[PDB]
Structure 1
């Protein structure tokens, strides 16, 4: 058989691109490891802090929108409507 061996392979490729998303997260790590501004070396000590920073990195977004349990976010959500109205008049 050829289709089956090559077919599952495509499914693996599909899995492969799902893997690519971590690179977005990697870029945050890259900022510190790769020096955000035009990179044209001590920060590795701080870079290891990214191990724990992985938990906090995803937490900043989760807590920024909601802050506390799924309830406080209702207050933050109103800001989105208010911002277009407020910005509408520079």
Structure 2
């Protein structure tokens, strides 16, 4: 089981506004900028 760690994980993914759910998208797309620079 992991019920208390699941509640914070749900908070960390996106339980209220924005979070990883959007910030996985913003950082990956940012990352392709400097990736074109160095690759």
Alignment TM class, shorter chain as reference? 0.3 to 0.5
Rg: which structure is higher? 1
Q: Which has the higher contact order (CA 8 A, sep 6+)?
A: 2
TM-score by length of 2: 0.45
TM-score normalised according to structure 1 size: 0.28
